[PDB]
């Protein structure tokens, strides 16, 4: 009887704090206890709404850490609908609840590569940020803004938001996962700016923390990143072992949503340097993975490889693919790919096409400017 809308609200906030700490077991426990008490009151909607919002967030974490859903034939995910339930009742909520709704909805839209959606939601959250009491929450927000801007190649804003998050995380006890991630963001941005010297340093600190944390997601991701950095430098051969290692980790612990990207870079590399047989072997594995993970976008990108190397070169298909990426705001991938294509046409005889594609790159940078 001690329990009251206020009693459970505090329990929910405690629950949230463990989520942010990536500590799966404590969260699970609190969630279960809390569900029971909720069932008991039956009384109040908003408290239930808060719970739903947290559960949504909780699931985002599980999906990230031990995402894999070796698929029970059909119970899933709570993510798709939970998104639905909350969406259904979004008018009901104000204050801190409005913040969480937008913030977490932003987070979801972000991992669907709906960068446009993600950023609007975030701006909306940002407005309600005055309702946020503790400093770690600001940190989470900064971290997410940073991540979103990174995907959009807003280098200055990404980097600066990473700094802000870092400062808050560092002064706190058990946020190594987020600290690790800040390093990743610092590195990936440095990579954008071509500052390879700094990039490496950060990538590495990140990786190192990944090992201390023993979390397969992050290990694979950190390795992938190191390899990405090598590849960026055109030193392809050196990237392979770093990619392969990342793949092994992702496969080992069944991190399916991460697998498509992995296969993709490795695959591109082999073709690139002529080792075709391995190329198809990786290609098939990656195409297959992108279906299983329902990454239609990566699926299209893999098809793009097909489009260019074999059947080389399916111009209409390439053009279509670029239009797709463009219409999906996916300007960074668009830029890289436009470059690959132009170079590829250059080493082959003819420059009509290569010049046109180089011209497309500059266009894309100017355009890439527009956003926020």
């Amino acid at each position: 009887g001690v329990i009251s809308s206020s009693s459970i609200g505090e329990k929910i906030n405690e629950w949230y704090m463990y989520i942010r700490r990536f500590s799966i077991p404590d969260a699970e426990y609190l969630r279960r206890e809390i569900k029971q008490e909720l069932d008991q009151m039956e009384e109040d909607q908003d408290l239930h709404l808060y719970y739903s919002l947290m559960e949504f967030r909780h699931n985002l974490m599980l999906e990230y850490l031990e995402p894999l859903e070796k698929m029970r034939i059909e119970e899933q995910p709570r993510l798709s609908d939970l998104l639905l339930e909350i969406d259904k009742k979004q008018a009901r909520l104000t204050g801190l609840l409005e913040y969480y709704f937008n913030f977490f909805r932003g987070m979801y839209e972000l991992d669907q590569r709906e960068y446009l959606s993600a950023i609007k939601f975030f701006k909306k959250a940002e407005s309600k940020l005055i309702f946020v009491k503790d400093r770690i929450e600001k940190a989470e927000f900064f971290f997410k803004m940073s991540e979103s801007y990174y995907y959009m190649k807003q280098t200055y804003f990404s980097m600066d938001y990473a700094r802000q998050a870092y400062e808050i995380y560092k002064e706190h006890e058990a946020y190594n996962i987020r600290l690790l991630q800040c390093h990743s963001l610092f590195a990936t941005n440095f990579l954008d700016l071509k500052q390879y010297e700094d990039a490496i340093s950060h990538f590495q600190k990140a990786y190192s923390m990944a090992e201390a944390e023993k979390q397969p997601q992050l290990m694979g991701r950190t390795l992938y990143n190191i390899g990405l950095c090598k590849n960026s430098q055109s030193q392809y051969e050196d990237a392979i072992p770093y990619f392969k290692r990342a793949i092994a980790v992702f496969e080992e612990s069944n991190i399916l949503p991460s697998l498509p990207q992995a296969y993709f870079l490795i695959t591109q590399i082999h073709y690139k340097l002529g080792k075709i047989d391995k190329a198809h072997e990786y290609h098939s594995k990656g195409m297959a993975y992108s279906q299983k993970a329902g990454d239609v976008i990566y699926l299209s990108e893999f098809e793009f490889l097909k489009s260019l190397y074999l059947s080389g070169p399916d111009e209409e298909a390439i053009q279509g693919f670029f239009d797709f990426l463009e219409s999906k705001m996916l300007y960074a991938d668009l830029e890289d790919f436009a470059i690959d294509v132009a170079k590829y046409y250059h080493e082959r005889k003819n420059f009509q096409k290569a010049s046109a594609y180089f011209l497309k790159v500059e266009q894309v940078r100017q355009l890439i400017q527009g956003g926020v």
Binding site: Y150, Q181, A187, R221, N225, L228, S258, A332, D336
Partner: peptide, 5 residues
């Protein structure tokens, strides 16, 4: 291709 954060 963007990094894996």
């Amino acid at each position: 291709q963007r990094g894996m954060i």
